[PDB]
Amino acid sequence: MVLMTKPGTSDFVWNGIPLSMELNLWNIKEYSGSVAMKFDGEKITFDADIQNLSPKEPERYVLGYPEFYYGYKPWENHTAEGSKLPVPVSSMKSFSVEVSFDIHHEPSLPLNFAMETWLTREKYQTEASIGDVEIMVWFYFNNLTPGGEKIEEFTIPFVLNGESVEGTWELWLAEWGWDYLAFRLKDPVKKGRVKFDVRHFLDAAGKALSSSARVKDFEDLYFTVWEIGTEFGSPETKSAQFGWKFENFSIDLEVR
Structure with a gap:
């Protein structure tokens, strides 16, 4: 059983992953105030009841992203052992x-339920920069725009x-220190079960960026991680x- 009550990261295994x-x-x-995240073998839960908040950098807009992920998160220079990622985008069949x-x-809290990956030029970067891409998929949002x-x-x-x-997905694009793409489901779902093939979003992203001057060789970038959080x-x-x-978490990565 994993229990955290302060900012931090713990690895775990769920359904063999x-x-x-x-x-x-x-x-x-x-x-x-309080924050608590827990994995008990069957589910992961997160709860926050916090006050006196202020941002480190208002320019990033959001305050946090409690989450769990599969693979290698560049900004944290971390991956649990055993992950099949990172892999070249081109090698991912599905x-x-x-x-x-x-x-x-x-009701008033800006929040989304969003998953994301980071496509980077080298396999194990510790940051994202020009030439790299962040792609998010938003299934739910409240008082928050990409x-x-x-x-x-x-x-x-x-x-x-x-x-x-x-589903009908809006594609939002931003050119920051890296390229930011966010696909946002037009009929948000606050509760339910979803299953989809990430390859569809990667193909839509490759097209959207096909005439880019910053992102070169999209299919040669490394698909590093899959993050799921709010x-x-x-x-x-x-x-x-x-x-x-x-x-009910599961994945099926088919690699060429």
């Missing part, structure tokens, strides 16, 4: 991810509660009360 969970308050300079979730929050600007929409299928559906807060958020539960 080696994973990391991070009680991630990366952009929070100070806070009072990558299915499935999880069920239940999110709760006080960064950058909305440029397109894509129809991409996924399985929602066991039913195969066609970003929350804005530069004005003073307190945050919210929590979630994730269950």
